[PDB]
Amino acid sequence: SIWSRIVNFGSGWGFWVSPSLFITSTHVIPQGAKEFFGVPIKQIQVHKSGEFCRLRFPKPIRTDVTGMILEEGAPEGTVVTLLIKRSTGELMPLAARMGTHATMKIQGRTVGGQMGMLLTGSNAKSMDLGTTPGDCGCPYIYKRGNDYVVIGVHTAAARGGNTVICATQ
Amino acid sequence: GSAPPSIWSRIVNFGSGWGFWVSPSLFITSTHVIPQGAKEFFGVPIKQIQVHKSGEFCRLRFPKPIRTDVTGMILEEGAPEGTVVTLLIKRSTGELMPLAARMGTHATMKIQGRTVGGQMGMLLTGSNAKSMDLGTTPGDCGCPYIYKRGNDYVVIGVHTAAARGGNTVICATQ
C-alpha cells in the first residue's frame, strides 16, 4: 500500500503525501518539463527548497491514498525508514538514524539537508541491495504514535552506502 | 556469455509457499508448505529424491543437475549470533522485498497450533515492521535467509514463523 505511493518520476522517484500533494527532488525533474501527471505546470503550485520539491495539484489525483504528515526533518537520533524502490522490482526498507543538518559534496555535486546513517548500509551493499544513484526521491518515513510522518526525500548517499542526506521542507 | 541469473530467480513457489535453489540439485524449503499429495517434484519421482528433514527445515537433493543456470551456494546451519542477514521475501503479487535481520540464539515458539523452532532474528526496518505495510506473513514461509561472507554467499535457512508483533522472526535450519 505504502509502496504504491512511491512512483517513477523523471530520472528518479517521487512520493504521494496526499491525494493532491507529491514530493520529489529537483535533481530528478527533467530539464524543460511542461506537464506533470497530465497537469500543465502553470496550474501546479511549486515550492522548491534546495533539492526538495513540493507539488500541489488543483485536483485530487490519486484519490486512493490516505494523507500523511509532512515535517521538516526529524529530531536528532530518531530512527526512520528509508523506502527505496528499484526499477527492477525490489522494495527495500532500510533503517536510518537521523543526525544533524549538513551540506555534502561527493562528485562535484553539492546537496544539503538532514544527514543520516544507515544502520545496515554496508550489509545491504555487500549483497548489492544498497543505495544507488537512481534511488533519489525516495521518502524517509517514520510512525509517531499513530501518526505517519514524512520527513523528506533522498538526494544523496556516500559511496560506502551508510551516510545519506535527506532533503527537507 | 549470458548474465548470471538473479538470486531472486532461485526462489520458487513450492506447494503453499516457497523454496530456494542452493545448487543445481539442492532445494531447501519448509516442511510446512510441502504439497504432500503427488509423487513428482519438478521432474523427479519422490522415491528418487534424497530427503533430509529437521523440524520445519526440508532439504531435497536431486539425482540430476536441474536448474543448470544456478551457481552453487554455501549452505550452513544458522549464523553466528549478531550477524546481520537478509531475508529475501518474494510474493505472488510480484513484489520482491529484502529485509535485514539481526540473528539471535536458537529458539522455539508456538504458531497456528504447532511448535516451530530454529534461530531467531529481529527485523531491522526502522519503524516497527507491522506499523507500515512491512513485515512477514504466513504466505512467505520458505523464503531464504542469506548473508555474504568475504566474496561468498551463505544460506542459513528458511522462514518459518513470526511473532504476533511482526518484529521477531524465526529461521529453520539444518
Q: What is the distance, to the nearest Å, from the Cα of residue A131 to the centroid of all Cα atoms in its chain? A: 12
Cross-sheet strand order for the sheet of B57-61: B11-14, B17-23, B26-30, B57-61, B50-54
Q: Determine whether B52 is an active site residue.
A: no
Could you tell me the three cell numbers for B26? Answer: 539442492
8 Å CB contact between A156 and A82: no
Alpha-helical (H) ranges within chain A are: 121-126
| B32 in catalytic set | yes
Q: State how far the Cα of A129 lies from the Cα of A154, in Å rounded to an integer.
A: 16
Query: How far does the CA of residue A65 sit from the closest CA of chain B (Å)?
Result: 14
Residue A73 grid coordinates: 526533518
Q: CA–CA separation, B116 vs B31, rounded Å?
A: 11
- Which CATH number is B1-72's, of 2.30.30.40, 2.40.10.10, 2.60.40.1930, 3.40.50.1000? 2.40.10.10
Resolution in units of Å: 2.7
Beta bridge partners of B52: B59
The CATH homologous superfamily for domain A1-67 is: Trypsin-like serine proteases (2.40.10.10)
How far apart, in whole angstroms, are the C-alpha atoms of residue B149 and residue B119?
19
Is the CB of residue A17 less than 8 Å from the CB of residue A47? no
Residue among A159, A30, A165 at smallest CA distance from A110: A165
Residue B56 annotated to the active site: yes
The answer to whether A48 touches A21, Cβ cutoff 8 Å, is no
Q: Are A65 and A34 in contact (CB under 8 A)?
A: no
- Name the residue facing A119 among B94, B124, B132 (closest C-beta): B124
d(CA A58, CA A165): 30
Q: Which three cell numbers stand for residue A151?
A: 520527513
| Record: fold of B73-174 | Thrombin, subunit H (2.40.10)
Single-letter amino acid code for the residue at A9:
F
Superfamily for A68-169? Trypsin-like serine proteases (2.40.10.10)
**B77 DSSP assignment:** S
Interface of A with B in 9-68 (CB under 8 A): none
Q: Which of B95, B131, B132 to mutate to test the interface with A (most CBs of A within 10 A)?
A: B132
> B116, B108 in Cβ contact below 8 A?
yes
Q: Across B77-143, where does the E strand assignment appear?
A: 84-90, 96-111, 114-123
- Delimit the CATH 2.40.10.10 region(s) of chain A: 1-67, 68-169
Please judge whether B98 and A141 are an interchain contact, meaning their C-beta atoms are less than 8 angstroms apart. Answer: no
Say yes or no for a CB contact (<8 Å) between B99 and A93: yes
Grid cell at residue A126: 555487500
Q: Which residues pair with B26 in a beta bridge?
A: B23, B61
Rounded Cα–Cα distance for residues B49 and B95 (Å)? 31
Report the distance separating Cα B160 and Cα A31, nearest Å: 49
In chain B, which residues fall in CATH 2.40.10.10?
1-72, 73-174
Deposited experimental method: X-ray
